[PDB]
Design a protein around this nucleic acid. Structure first.
Lengths: 57, 49
RNA sequence: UGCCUGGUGUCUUGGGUGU
């Protein structure tokens, strides 16, 4: 569909970052809280993006 | 009684399942952080599915 | 006049209960 599903949109060029409501953090104990799995995966993705940008230039 | 009754001693044993350890009710209470639905468990004042 | 408190992990696993 030209308006809604264009074929080139199947390739990701910009990634949407969900709000913390989607990936809430949990307090494992009284002091240390735990980052969610999605948060760690997004951190890894962003590190890889930074690495690619640094290497390219 | 018009009917005679079978009558005698028998060995009975009390099992761990008592009603006061199973009765549970909930009007409102804690909810999960991710889904904002009632938590699971009688010990946590949870809801029924 | 000294004045009262609501806020509860998560993920696995195991053993059970009623059909």
């Amino acid at each position: 569909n030209e308006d809604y599903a264009r074929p080139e949109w199947m390739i990701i060029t910009v990634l949407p970052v969900p709000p913390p409501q989607v990936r809430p953090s949990i307090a494992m104990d009284e002091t240390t809280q735990g980052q969610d799995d999605l948060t760690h995966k997004l951190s890894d993705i962003l590190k890889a993006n930074i690495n690619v940008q640094k290497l390219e230039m | 009684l018009m009917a005679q009754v079978f009558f005698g001693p028998t060995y009975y044993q009390r099992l761990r399942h008592m009603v006061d350890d199973k009765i549970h009710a909930r009007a409102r209470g804690p909810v999960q952080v991710l889904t904002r639905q009632p938590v699971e468990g009688r010990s946590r004042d949870g809801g029924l599915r």
